Amino acid sequence: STSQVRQNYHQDSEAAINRQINLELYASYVYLSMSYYFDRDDVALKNFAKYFLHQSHEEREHAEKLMKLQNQRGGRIFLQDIQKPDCDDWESGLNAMECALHLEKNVNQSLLELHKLATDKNDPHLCDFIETHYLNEQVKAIKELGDHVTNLRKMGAPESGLAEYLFDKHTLG
């Protein structure tokens, strides 16, 4: 049953990777939902839509890299259902950016737990993988989303509809 390639790869690490795959796929689905909210005729913020669609595709790439890792290490991928997002209607550009920030911080927390597990199981390859490919990407994403939230709030969103319009044009365009 043990893979010919497997070396220094704990069952707990393998399980945590499978959980992370699901979380990344979930995040991709959330961003997809947000994207198409902004594409609605009654919302009509094209650059918000583009921004979130890009994020969706990036999360899918992150999931696929974890799947690749699992196989590289001789673990076995077990997929689970991808839960639907928490909202159908994301309310506003500001509300979506705030929800994105919350999601990114949740993903980051999971990655930090995975890193801790890798370190505890003396799996330096896995720890390095997470550091190299995931942790700075998350810090950057969180900082960007925080910047966006700050700007939208300062401009008068979400009650000032001119604010979201201009942010869409000048920041996200």
Work out whether 58 is an interface residue with its own copies (CB under 8 A).
no
Angstrom distance (rounded) from CA 172 to CA 148: 9
Tell me which of 43, 96, 103, 172 binds its own copies, using CB under 8 A.
43
Work out whether 15 is an interface residue with its own copies (CB under 8 A).
no
- 106 touches which of its own copies, Na ion, none (CB within 5 to 8 A by kind)? none
Angstrom distance (rounded) from CA 95 to CA 148: 11
What Cα–Cα distance (Å) separates residue 154 from each residue in 23, 157, 161, 167? 32, 8, 13, 11
Please check whether residue 56 is in contact with residue 26, taking contact to mean a CB–CB distance below 8 angstroms. Answer: no
User: By CB under 8 A, what part of segment 74-103 binds its own copies?
Assistant: 74, 76-85, 88, 101
Work out whether 65 is an interface residue with its own copies (CB under 8 A).
no
User: What is the CB neighbour count within 10 angstroms for residue 96?
Assistant: 27
Tell me which of 65, 110, 112, 121 binds its own copies, using CB under 8 A.
112
Phi, psi of 109 (to 5 degrees): -60, -45
What Cα–Cα distance (Å) separates residue 123 from each residue in 9, 28, 60, 132, 137? 7, 28, 25, 14, 21
Tell me which of 15, 44, 54, 91 binds its own copies, using CB under 8 A.
44
Provide, rounded to whole angstroms, the least separation between the CB of residue 63 and Na ion. 7
Work out whether 62 is an interface residue with Na ion (CB under 5 A).
yes
Which residue is nearest to Na ion, using beta carbons?
62
Is 138 part of any known ligand binding site?
Answer: yes
Site string for Na ion, 7-46 (x = CB under 5 A): -----------------x----------------------
How far does CA 33 lie from the centroid of its chain? 13
Work out whether 110 is an interface residue with its own copies (CB under 8 A).
no
